[model samples]
Target: MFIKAERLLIRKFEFKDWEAVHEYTSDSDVMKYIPEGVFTEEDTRNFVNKNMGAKNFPVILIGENILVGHIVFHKYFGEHTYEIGWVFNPKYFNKGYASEAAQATLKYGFKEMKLHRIIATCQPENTPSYRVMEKIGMRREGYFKKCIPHGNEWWDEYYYAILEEE
Candidate 1:
């Protein structure tokens, strides 16, 4: 998987990014909406080992070589349907990076990779992820009840999907 936007380069995760990963994932603001808590360095390293440069691309911020987030395509639904999603440092919130990276990634998945569909799901209250989906043109396909047990409360999940048909 290869993706590059104006200020970002969606590339593989390297061992050098350990500190950067710790820094971003450790931000409580970023972790607030995440289903899982912040990651330990070992957890992050294991994730990197298993997923780095896999079908999913963990794009790092180019200049500082920091891990901003990742865009992964997994769980093939058929010949061309793929599940797609992303996550980023909350400190980078309100910036267009998620949308920029998502748009480019979707273009690659649909136009270049020739995938039939790409879908994402997030907590209904996650306005940030939904906004990114909206900006990247993902249409809400479903809203399921109690789909995720988010800590103390069960939360509704919104499913967003985009197809190649436009």
Candidate 2:
């Protein structure tokens, strides 16, 4: 399935995406918050495989026919609920790609997928992600205290969600 926004085409990930994906994933600044840091070409290849094979949505971005980033939806508790996540090349940041793509994905979930609710979580310090969530009509649901352990320290997370209109 394909989801289109104003400036992006969100579709299934392909093998050819590794080169552009590695550009962002290999950068220290771009991958700082991610657990998988500085991915090699092989690492990116495996990533593409896992995402392509998963039943959950693992869609890639195409702006100007170049792979820019990806967004994902992971099944959570049941058929009606899911959790969303996304990452984008820093080169394409601040131009509203994430927001546009995320909004389209949210619409796809509520409309095409017939989902009841969709949720997303991010580290409390991740203002960019939260801003995207907010821009897409999700409301802050909770602040989880010291929930995710990054390395030696625990990090807090914020949860946001939206439900289909009745």
Candidate 3:
């Protein structure tokens, strides 16, 4: 499936997108929330291969063109519930691309997939992610402290959710 937006095209990963994806995956700033510091080209290719068939795995682009980042939606519960996430090139920060992609992904999940609810989670320090969730009309649903352990410390997460009726 394809999700088209004013400035983006959310589609599946292609072999040609490996380098573009690697550009951000290899950037420490972009991968900070993820435990993996940086990825080599081989690692990136494996990632692309792994996610190539995932439903609603969006390889986002600008004006239906430049590859900027990716968005994700997958089952978090039963068939009626799902979770969403995103990562972008730091160069594209503050350009509304992440929010745009997320909004589109939510649209697909709720309208196209007929899901009952969509959820998201982010580190408390990941202001951008929670802000995006709020901007897209998701509310803070829960807080789990020290849930994810990184190298030397544990991290807390804020859970956010939106219902189909809302």
Candidate 4:
């Protein structure tokens, strides 16, 4: 969960980073598709603590300690395969930050972890987001029909994947 990309630092979340984390987290638009939706100050505090933060990588700027986003990479069905994804502040959108961060995480997963494969999924309409998956060399694996229950909406998902050998 630790990576130093060209312009970002993907590292373990700190207790002190809670404030900055809550900046984007408390915003509904920033958490549009996320199941939890917008979070409260208390929720962010507990999250930044070891509750859930320990399992996630918090992304930041190269020369700044400001929290910009988070890259989610976790084991899935098996140890050989993992699910990877990212959630970035819209303020940093269109800057390629999400892709760079996720790409580095994927590299670490395959090259360092020696995993067999990595997968990711997102709403089909999130073009800006799916582009990150492709930019990192993950091919489209499938398009499931309304398989995700996002709040009150049934969202279709586009699954993408990449093999270690590739």
Candidate 5:
């Protein structure tokens, strides 16, 4: 399946974009919020290989026909729910590409994927991610204290979720 936006297209990752993907995923600033950001090239390659055939789809963004960022919906439970996630170049911050892609992904999740629920979470300190979750219509559900371990300390995060029926 393909998700198209006015100036973006979320499609599958290609072997050719490995270097570009590495550039973004390897950056400390980018990886700071991600669980595994400081990765060796080999680790990233292995991750790509393992996730290639996953139920999730990692769509590379093509803005003005140029590649910029990526988004993916994975961690499938084969039910009506799954975790959604995305990231982009810091240079492109404040742009609405992430929101657009997220909205479109929600559409795909609820309609095409026939899911009953979709959930997203963000590091409590990451305001931008929570903003995107709000823009996509997820409601703040719960907070798990010290649920995830970060570089120096553990963090509590807000979980947001959406369901077609109640």
Candidate 6:
């Protein structure tokens, strides 16, 4: 296990964790912001196998060892810098669990990973997600317009970030 938040646990995804991961990824709404959108069971399983990175940790409810969502943390640009993002089961939404998971992930990046900067990006209309980034002290750094092509059209993205000094 990594660090424990108030009511959540962030840990590496084991082989058997794909089922829990699939729970959220298969939900259509949860994949709205994700470029690839909702995934098949096989895709989810393969993703778990391939993307089990050193710090791409999974978030658990700490209730029934219920894996709620996951954090996407990895080298983004340069030395000791990384990008961060998340997804959660809607069933666990509105409980401040996303914020809690993000808060702990940032701590781990800065203190343990010795990172200089951590950044995140989300859709501007994704009020819930961007709010969590702001709640965790990340600044809204950029609003790149028509940058991502999702579904059949273009989408803009808001960039949020926090530095070690912050």
Estimate the lDDT of model 2.
Answer: 0.80
TM-scores of the candidates in the order shown: 0.87, 0.91, 0.93, 0.93, 0.88, 0.94
Candidate No. with top lDDT = 6
Across residues 22-102, which tens digit of lDDT does each residue of candidate 3 receive? 899999888889778789999888888888877435456665477888887888999999999998888789988888889
Q: Flag the better candidate by lDDT, 1 or 3.
A: 3
Stretches of model 4 off by over 4 angstroms after superposition: 51-53
Cand. 3 Cα-lDDT:
0.86
Candidate 5 lDDT, 14-59, residue by residue in tens: 5565566676778898878888766678866776666665533454
- Name the regions of candidate 3 deviating beyond 4 angstroms: 62-64
The 0-to-1 C-alpha lDDT of every candidate, in the order given, reads 0.77, 0.80, 0.86, 0.86, 0.75, 0.88
User: Which candidate would rank higher by lDDT, 3 or 6?
Assistant: 6
- lDDT of model 2, residue 165: 90
Residue 126 CA error for candidate 2 (Å)?
1.0
Q: Which residue pairs collide, candidate 4?
A: none
Q: Measured by TM-score, how close is model 3 to the native structure?
A: 0.93
Q: Show how many residue pairs clash in every candidate, following the order shown.
A: 1, 0, 0, 0, 0, 0
- Please give the lDDT score for candidate 1: 0.77
Instruction: Quote the positional error of residue 83 for candidate 4 in Å.
Output: 0.8
lDDT score, candidate 5, position 123:
82
Candidate 6's residue-wise lDDT over 5-79, tens digit each? Answer: 888898888889999889989999999889888999998988898866564678987777788889888889887
- Point out where model 5 deviates above 4 Å: 55-63
Please give the range of 10 consecutive residues that has the lowest summed lDDT in model 2: 55-64
